[PDB]
Amino acid sequence: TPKGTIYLTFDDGPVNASVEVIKVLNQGGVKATFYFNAWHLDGIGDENEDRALEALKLALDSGHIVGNHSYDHMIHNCVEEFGPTSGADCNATGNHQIHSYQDPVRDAASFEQNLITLEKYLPTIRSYPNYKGYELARLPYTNGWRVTKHFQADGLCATSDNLKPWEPGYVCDPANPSNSVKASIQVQNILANQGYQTHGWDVDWAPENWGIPMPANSLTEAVPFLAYVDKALNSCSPTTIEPINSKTQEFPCGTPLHADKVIVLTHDFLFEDGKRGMGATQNLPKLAEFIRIAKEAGYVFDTMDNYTPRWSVGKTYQAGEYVLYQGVVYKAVISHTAQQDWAPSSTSSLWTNADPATNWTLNVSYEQGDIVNYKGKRYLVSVPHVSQQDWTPDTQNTLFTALELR
Amino acid sequence: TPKGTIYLTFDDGPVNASVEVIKVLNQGGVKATFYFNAWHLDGIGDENEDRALEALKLALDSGHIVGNHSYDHMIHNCVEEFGPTSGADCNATGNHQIHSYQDPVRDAASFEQNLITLEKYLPTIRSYPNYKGYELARLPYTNGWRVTKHFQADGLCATSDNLKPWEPGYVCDPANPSNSVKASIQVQNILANQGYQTHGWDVDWAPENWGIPMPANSLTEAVPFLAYVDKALNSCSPTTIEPINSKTQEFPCGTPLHADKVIVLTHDFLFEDGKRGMGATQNLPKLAEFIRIAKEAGYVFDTMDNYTPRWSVGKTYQAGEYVLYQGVVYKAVISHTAQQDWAPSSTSSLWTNADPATNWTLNVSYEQGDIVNYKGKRYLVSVPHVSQQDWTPDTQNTLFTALELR
């Protein structure tokens, strides 16, 4: 039995730096999850990205999981008019974390545009089972979670409306979050209703010092980082992680799906020799060494499509246990032994749909106080029940109470 | 038992004309399927479309099914640079059917852009179960079908590379189709791999004479059109329909899923008082009367989400019968009685996946000669089998033969 499971997740690719990152992973004998921004394929992401397509292809060919990080990392909210120079313009101002989210609909759409661009530059991408761009996502800047109906939480200070977390006079009030945060929360919900899961992170492999000309050089060494991983194991890191804009204040500590697991966040661009330092020369060895010693310590590596364990034939389940089946999350209604022909579904008596969505859905175990959307209207669940085709909110006024607005 | 089932399908909405069309359907006590182009919501589709959003909302609120007809009805292939006036520019040239399809990837993407725009103007649209924009589609100009693994066929002369079907010297060779047709075929396959079904039509409710100033006025009357529907019932109309660019030459006549059914194609814009004639004043009554007398003749009306019959608990199925379950097509492997807990799936022994796709998929009954895509490579099925996770094409060289290219 493993000491635990580590999920290496790389954000902001695909870029030139991604190629060697992938090769190190391959030599290390591990799979990882890449949350990509497709604008690098268009060559407007303001990075060394002429090999972007090559990297995307190598990632998928090597069997790594590809997830959705939005088309432009929300840079359209950093400038006045989004264009080919917007990435450079935002880097000049460094206002990434200010007004990061504004119109949730427009921002959520950025994730769908991502799919179009990916499927434009790599028309065969859907033929890869490890392509999960339409199932797995992660919001820029935001340690936010949409995993199950009862496993979700937001980064309540991920982004700001004025001051950056380090600037003098910065105030973070989780109870009354910024407009930007509120928008990101709505974005989470929109994506969840489109069938997405979203995952945050436990630990962030980043420079120990951003106050030097080559901060990438200060990336935590392998031995030290393993200690940080060890410390994160079963310690509800999302609540204690620093800085404050990386927190998930209301993360459900000790939640079964999170036990014995550590999700590592890092970025491809930290592993290249460039404007952030000698990341390739110095950090690629740190990655290779970490993988080796983590395995020596008894860790195994897995990908985010397995974070929620896939339904497996032969296994016994207890009522209340969660599984992932065909991209949909299910919770066991009664303890039983999973048979080939009795998989979870929208009609099974053995399972109920437990996706982290809010739109009215079939075979969900609804509880008093739950709020669902149905045909453009919001309804409150008044009495607990399992939803079925007959019991639509607009007809069942004993089960549902129509909510008023304004 | 019904004499048959009619599927009223309206293309090219949503526009002002759609509002009264929907009201007539509602008064008639029937549901219908609308294949929409979202560019009308942006106000660049060159129609009276200021009430476009109102119509979209009314269609969904009334319980009608909404399907995908692409964002701009492929008008970007009709002009040099697509813009707000492109719809008007294409109407000036009337080159809709020339070079209608060029880059299949770009064209297929038009269907995904459609979803973005729809979900932009109506952010609550996914809360409607009758919203099927991501499951049901129909290609502009093209009587093409992607229904099941063994139920698919293309409009081999739907579009041209030079001359229009009526112009002197026009040649249609189904055995060697135009470049435009070939592109539309690839588009069909791309959409199918994204989980879409596509449906053509049996009969087309259109003007009897386009050679007058108000052709809409000549729309077939109710009594006559019922006769045409009667004639289409179980007669493989897609092969005999006129004009030639509306044909489905290789349509599988007598195929079980098509028996006792007639899909009617028409357009919202034929029911408005405008540049095509007095469609509202004259044709809305024809629609209302047709619905009434069709019912009197013993027909029932259904929508395209039911064209492939939904899996139903309690019903017995014979091996070889097709069903639709959670948007996926399945074929019965063994005759049995459908139970609540034994629905179709990717692991069921009772059903196999029979979607009209070409990417390698789980639990599909593959036959010798079948060609699948897997991780960017094409493989030929050498020996018949049912696919499973272990038997991926890249490892099973007794089941699959890798194809070479160029």
Ligand SMILES: [Ca+2]
């Ligand atoms: Ca999902």
Ligand SMILES: [Ca+2]
């Ligand atoms: Ca489907």
Ligand SMILES: [Zn+2]
């Ligand atoms: Zn990022």
Ligand SMILES: [Zn+2]
């Ligand atoms: Zn059309």
